[PDB]
Design an enzyme around this catalytic site. Structure first.
Site, short mmCIF file in Angstrom:
data_model
loop_
_atom_site.label_atom_id
_atom_site.label_comp_id
_atom_site.label_asym_id
_atom_site.label_seq_id
_atom_site.Cartn_x
_atom_site.Cartn_y
_atom_site.Cartn_z
N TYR A 276 68.15 68.33 67.77
CA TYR A 276 67.89 69.66 68.31
C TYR A 276 68.44 70.83 67.51
O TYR A 276 67.68 71.67 67.01
CB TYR A 276 68.41 69.74 69.75
CG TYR A 276 68.15 68.50 70.58
CD1 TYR A 276 69.13 67.52 70.73
CD2 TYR A 276 66.91 68.30 71.19
CE1 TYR A 276 68.89 66.36 71.47
CE2 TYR A 276 66.66 67.14 71.93
CZ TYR A 276 67.64 66.17 72.06
OH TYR A 276 67.37 65.00 72.76
N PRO B 188 61.50 70.98 77.72
CA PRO B 188 60.60 70.36 78.71
C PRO B 188 60.42 71.15 80.00
O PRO B 188 61.40 71.52 80.66
CB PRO B 188 61.27 69.01 78.98
CG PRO B 188 62.11 68.79 77.78
CD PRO B 188 62.68 70.14 77.51
N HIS C 113 66.74 71.03 75.92
CA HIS C 113 67.01 69.62 75.71
C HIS C 113 68.38 69.22 75.13
O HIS C 113 68.88 68.12 75.42
CB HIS C 113 65.88 69.06 74.86
CG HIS C 113 65.35 67.75 75.33
ND1 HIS C 113 66.15 66.65 75.50
CD2 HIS C 113 64.09 67.35 75.59
CE1 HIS C 113 65.40 65.61 75.83
NE2 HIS C 113 64.14 66.01 75.89
N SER D 8 58.11 59.21 77.64
CA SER D 8 59.32 59.03 78.42
C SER D 8 58.97 58.88 79.93
O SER D 8 57.90 59.29 80.37
CB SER D 8 60.25 60.24 78.20
OG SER D 8 59.53 61.47 78.22
C1 LIG Z 1 63.68 52.16 80.25
C2 LIG Z 1 63.57 52.69 81.68
C3 LIG Z 1 62.46 53.74 81.76
C4 LIG Z 1 63.23 51.53 82.62
O1 LIG Z 1 63.43 51.90 83.97
P1 LIG Z 1 63.18 50.87 85.18
O2 LIG Z 1 63.28 51.62 86.45
O3 LIG Z 1 64.03 49.67 84.99
O4 LIG Z 1 61.62 50.46 84.98
P2 LIG Z 1 60.87 49.39 85.95
O5 LIG Z 1 59.46 49.27 85.55
O6 LIG Z 1 61.69 48.16 86.06
O7 LIG Z 1 60.89 50.12 87.39
C5 LIG Z 1 61.89 49.78 88.33
C6 LIG Z 1 61.29 49.24 89.63
O8 LIG Z 1 60.37 48.12 89.28
C7 LIG Z 1 60.98 46.86 89.68
N1 LIG Z 1 60.71 45.69 88.78
C8 LIG Z 1 61.07 45.56 87.49
N2 LIG Z 1 60.66 44.37 87.03
C9 LIG Z 1 60.05 43.74 88.02
C10 LIG Z 1 59.42 42.50 88.14
N3 LIG Z 1 59.38 41.66 87.12
N4 LIG Z 1 58.86 42.16 89.33
C11 LIG Z 1 58.89 42.99 90.38
N5 LIG Z 1 59.49 44.18 90.28
C12 LIG Z 1 60.05 44.59 89.12
C13 LIG Z 1 62.47 47.19 89.88
O9 LIG Z 1 63.06 46.32 90.85
C14 LIG Z 1 62.44 48.60 90.39
O10 LIG Z 1 62.18 48.59 91.81
P3 LIG Z 1 62.54 49.87 92.75
O11 LIG Z 1 61.30 50.67 92.93
O12 LIG Z 1 63.27 49.38 93.93
O13 LIG Z 1 63.56 50.72 91.83
C15 LIG Z 1 64.91 53.32 82.12
O14 LIG Z 1 65.90 52.29 82.25
C16 LIG Z 1 65.38 54.38 81.10
O15 LIG Z 1 66.08 54.06 80.14
N6 LIG Z 1 64.94 55.63 81.32
C17 LIG Z 1 65.29 56.75 80.43
C18 LIG Z 1 64.68 58.07 80.94
C19 LIG Z 1 65.04 59.24 80.02
O16 LIG Z 1 66.19 59.37 79.56
N7 LIG Z 1 64.04 60.07 79.75
C20 LIG Z 1 64.20 61.25 78.88
C21 LIG Z 1 62.98 62.17 79.04
S1 LIG Z 1 63.13 63.74 78.10
#
Ligand SMILES: CC(C)(COP(=O)(O)OP(=O)(O)OC[C@H]1O[C@@H](n2cnc3c(N)ncnc32)[C@H](O)[C@@H]1OP(=O)(O)O)[C@@H](O)C(=O)NCCC(=O)NCCS
Length: 596
Positions: free
Chosen positions: A78, A91, A314, A525
């Site tokens: 940044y 954003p 950001h 993201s």
């Molecule tokens: C990488 C990332 C996006 C993954 O997130 P995540 O929530 O683990 O993604 P998932 O697809 O697993 O979604 C979670 C949900 O799906 C479920 N799930 C995951 N795998 C599953 C499976 N195999 N079977 C059934 N359910 C599953 C989880 O239990 C969870 O359920 P919930 O609704 O009770 O929470 C997150 O960990 C991350 O790092 N985000 C960063 C965001 C950020 O910084 N953005 C910047 C923008 S400028």
């Protein structure tokens, strides 16, 4: 004492990372170039070569630093980015449209909103913020102590960020902009008790009248030009005693609130897109862009018709923290009412003036010309996927985000005939001070799948098995990334560490497979919000997109950006194809039950 229990950002083994560098390159680089990199990488990690030396560097920058990536990343991503902050960095956000329908209800909400933020700041200042978990481990809470009472500043070579949060006399005011004119506004008493909605409203209703008529120049629109021009422009702007105090106030503000003006309404099919634009850039120089100060970390913008949202800087943090404040705030705007006790004696707000000169007259007119060009080149599309959300992927024992990330590959591939360098922001907050890493969705199982799909020679039975493989292959990357086991950050580390050591820029970085792997056609993201809101941001390259979404339970808010300068991209079309990609995957998964 919570930031001392968290583990520090590790350093993946050179061999391990450089391995995943190869694996992930196959699908996006020629079978020719991959062979080259293959030989180059073996040479890099030779026992007693460059790589082994630089690796020792990062394995030292950790023992003498809380986080060996903090400074480099912030500076690299940044602060040094000399392009505008608008559309390219900061954003925007779209929140549930409020119902008020008059100039008193608009102010009413602003008040309710302002009270919510402070109620949230309490937990921050009082350090009583609940522990956030990223699975089964504690998350770094730092980012929350950087978003309020801060601001970014224009530097001739590098930019700086002023933070007035934990200072001697912590500001007690905020900024309010109506008709391009700024006003200061305290929200605390000489007793420590915050201002209730009533007071704030009477204070907001007083600020309100003081700027009833618009006529002044939008000095604030100066923070949307190039960073080399604003640097010089800002430098001159603060050569006046009042001016300087004026900007000095804004940079101390706990945050800003903008009361935007009317705008010629458009159809509803292109409504959502007219708001997202009004929230990211402002919609031209003759509309609302002058009702801003894009250097300010947090700017809460409340429209007239009822539209509302925001736009932050950001450098401070990623969308999660910011939205884990939006959820709490929108919550406060809905809850009941308590003690609406009489209006205590409240003082008048200070109007922040700006001595307009002929020298500044031009910079103000040169800004409009720039901003107005960045906009006529922005192409955005807002997709609300009602068909389903986390519900379906979950019912298929498949990860929702992976499943959504495989659909984009398919959708993109279903448009250009090839896989591309794809980026998915992955938070490393399970580590002290940590920020993010890269999740590359373009893989081996990803390409095999998108091809095994449209391949009329492959049976639906082998198709589904190719879909599932991808979804879990991506999940493993996700799980490996958030645990400091990715490679993009480590990679950028060896590069910068190489510079420092004062050695020959390694061939590996000068490699073709490098200029490609870093060229992200799909910048994405996920930013889950307990509130039905969506975040957005332009593309990282000229020939690509910007894609951010909010995965709910029964649907998904999607934003898609692109530049008209590039005829090879069209936001609506990618949006129109992603929609079909997710629906298609579902039809294939519901037809062939793996079990039951
Ligand atoms: C990488 C990332 C996006 C993954 O997130 P995540 O929530 O683990 O993604 P998932 O697809 O697993 O979604 C979670 C949900 O799906 C479920 N799930 C995951 N795998 C599953 C499976 N195999 N079977 C059934 N359910 C599953 C989880 O239990 C969870 O359920 P919930 O609704 O009770 O929470 C997150 O960990 C991350 O790092 N985000 C960063 C965001 C950020 O910084 N953005 C910047 C923008 S400028």
């Amino acid at each position: 004492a919570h930031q001392d229990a968290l583990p520090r950002l590790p350093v993946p083994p050179l061999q391990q990372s450089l391995d995943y560098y190869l694996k992930a390159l196959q699908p996006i680089v020629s079978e020719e170039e991959w062979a080259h990199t293959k030989q180059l990488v073996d040479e890099f990690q030779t026992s007693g070569g460059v790589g082994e030396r630089l690796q020792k560097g990062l394995e030292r920058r950790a023992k003498k630093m809380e986080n060996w990536l903090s400074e480099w990343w912030l500076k690299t991503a940044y602060l040094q980015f000399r392009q505008p902050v608008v559309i390219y960095s900061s954003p925007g956000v779209i929140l549930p449209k409020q119902d008020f329908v008059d100039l008193q209800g608009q102010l009413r909400f602003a008040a309710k909103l302002i009270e919510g933020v402070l109620d949230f700041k309490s937990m921050i200042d009082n350090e009583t913020l609940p522990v956030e978990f990223l699975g089964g481990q504690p998350l770094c809470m730092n980012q929350y102590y950087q978003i309020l009472s801060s601001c970014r500043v224009p530097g001739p070579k590098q930019d700086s960020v002023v933070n007035f949060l934990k200072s001697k006399r912590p500001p007690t005011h905020i900024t309010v902009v109506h008709n391009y004119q700024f006003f200061e506004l305290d929200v605390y008493h000489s007793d420590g008790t915050p201002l209730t909605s009533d007071q704030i409203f009477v204070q907001l209703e007083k600020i309100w009248n003081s700027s009833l008529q618009s006529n002044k120049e939008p000095v604030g629109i100066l923070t949307s030009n190039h960073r080399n021009t604003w640097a010089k422009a800002y430098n001159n702007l603060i050569k006046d005693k009042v001016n300087r105090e004026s900007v000095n106030s804004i940079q101390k503000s706990i945050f800003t609130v903008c009361l935007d003006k009317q705008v010629p309404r458009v159809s509803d099919d292109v409504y959502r897109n007219h708001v997202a634009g009004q929230m990211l850039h402002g919609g031209g120089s003759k509309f609302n862009s002058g009702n801003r100060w894009f250097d300010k970390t947090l700017q809460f913008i409340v429209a007239e018709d009822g539209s509302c949202g925001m736009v932050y800087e950001h450098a401070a943090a990623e969308g999660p923290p910011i939205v884990a404040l939006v959820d709490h705030v929108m919550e406060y705007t809905k809850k009941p009412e308590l003690v609406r006790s009489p209006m205590v004696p409240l003082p008048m707000p200070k109007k922040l003036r700006f001595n307009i000169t002929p020298e500044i007259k031009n910079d103000i007119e040169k800004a409009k010309q720039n901003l107005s060009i960045m906009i006529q080149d922005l192409d955005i599309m807002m997709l609300t996927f009602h068909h389903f959300g986390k519900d379906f992927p979950k019912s298929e024992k498949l990860s929702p985000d992976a499943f959504i990330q495989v659909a984009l590959q398919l959708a993109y591939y279903r448009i250009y005939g090839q896989a591309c360098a794809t980026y998915e922001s992955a938070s490393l907050r399970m580590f002290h001070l940590g920020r993010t890493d890269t999740i590359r969705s373009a893989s081996i199982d990803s390409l095999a799948f998108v091809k095994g799909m449209g391949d009329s020679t492959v049976p639906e039975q082998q198709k589904v098995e190719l879909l599932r493989k991808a979804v879990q292959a991506h999940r493993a990357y996700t799980d490996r990334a958030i645990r400091g086991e990715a490679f993009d950050r480590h990679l950028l580390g060896l590069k910068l560490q190489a510079i420092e050591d004062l050695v020959s820029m390694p061939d590996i970085f000068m490699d073709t497979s490098y200029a490609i792997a870093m060229h992200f056609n799909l910048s994405t993201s996920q930013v889950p919000a307990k509130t039905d809101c969506v975040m957005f941001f332009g593309p990282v390259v000229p020939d690509g997109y910007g894609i951010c979404y909010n995965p709910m339970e029964a649907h998904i808010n999607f934003s898609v950006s692109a530049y008209n300068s590039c005829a090879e991209t069209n936001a609506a079309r990618m949006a129109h194809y992603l929609e079909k990609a997710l629906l298609d995957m579902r039809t294939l998964l519901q037809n062939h039950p793996r079990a039951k």
